[PDB]
UniProtKB/Swiss-Prot annotation:
GO terms for MF: lysozyme activity
Impact noted for substituting residue 30 to A: Almost complete loss of enzymatic activity
Protein name: Endolysin
Effect listed in the UniProt record for changing residue 117 to F: 10-fold decrease in enzymatic activity
Catalysed reactions, as listed in the record: Hydrolysis of (1->4)-beta-linkages between N-acetylmuramic acid and N-acetyl-D-glucosamine residues in a peptidoglycan and between N-acetyl-D-glucosamine residues in chitodextrins
Major localisation: host cell
InterPro entries: Endolysin_T4_type, Glyco_hydro_24, Lysozyme-like_dom_sf, Lysozyme_dom_sf, Phage_lysozyme-like, T4-type_lysozyme
Phylogenetic classification of the source organism: Viruses, Duplodnaviria, Heunggongvirae, Uroviricota, Caudoviricetes
UniProt-reported outcome of changing residue 26 to E: Complete loss of activity at neutral pH; covalently bound substrate
Family statement: Belongs to the glycosyl hydrolase 24 family.
Organism superkingdom: Viruses
Effect of residue 20 to E/Q: Loss of 99% of enzymatic activity
Species name: Enterobacteria phage T4
Length: 164
């Protein structure tokens, strides 16, 4: 299992513009287009993103191209972030994937706000950090996904994703 397979279990693949758990316009593998309520604003961002007139629909290939950019940007954001970098460097390969998954879903900013859990993960207090991560809007709003990510940080293995 790797970061791309993991995220693709979590986000799914949709070739037509759709709404987020959040109500936001998205396409592909969890590629947020706009937080704006117009399908028209979304369509426009879509065409800007792909470089063609898409009419709200893309190919598998265009979806994976967006996914490759988003993953790359997530990692680079982690590496550039003063709060994130140190935690990332301290972690093993599997747990590194769990932090990347959080950043992909919630952005650099959002994750950097989990101060206390970040501190515990750095310290390698896995069980404590798992309890702390669960006390969040994130977990309450998307519990099955949060629980998979959390188990991943807890154990350091890919079992939460075996099932799936």
């Amino acid at each position: 299992m790797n970061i791309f397979e993991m995220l693709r279990i979590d986000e799914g693949l949709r070739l037509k513009i759709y709404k987020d758990t959040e109500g936001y316009y998205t396409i592909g593998i969890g590629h947020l287009l706009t937080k704006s309520p117009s399908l028209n604003a979304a369509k426009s961002e879509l065409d800007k993103a792909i470089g063609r007139n898409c009419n709200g629909v893309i190919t598998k290939d265009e979806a994976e191209k967006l996914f490759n950019q988003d993953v790359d940007a997530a990692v680079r954001g982690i590496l550039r972030n003063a709060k994130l970098k140190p935690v990332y460097d301290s972690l093993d390969a599997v747990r590194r994937c769990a932090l990347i998954n959080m950043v992909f879903q919630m952005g650099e900013t959002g994750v950097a706000g989990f101060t206390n859990s970040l501190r515990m993960l750095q310290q390698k207090r896995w069980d404590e950090a798992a309890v702390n991560l669960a006390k969040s809007r994130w977990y309450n709003q998307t519990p099955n996904r949060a629980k998979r990510v959390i188990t991943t940080f807890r154990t350091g293995f890919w079992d939460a994703y075996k099932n799936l």
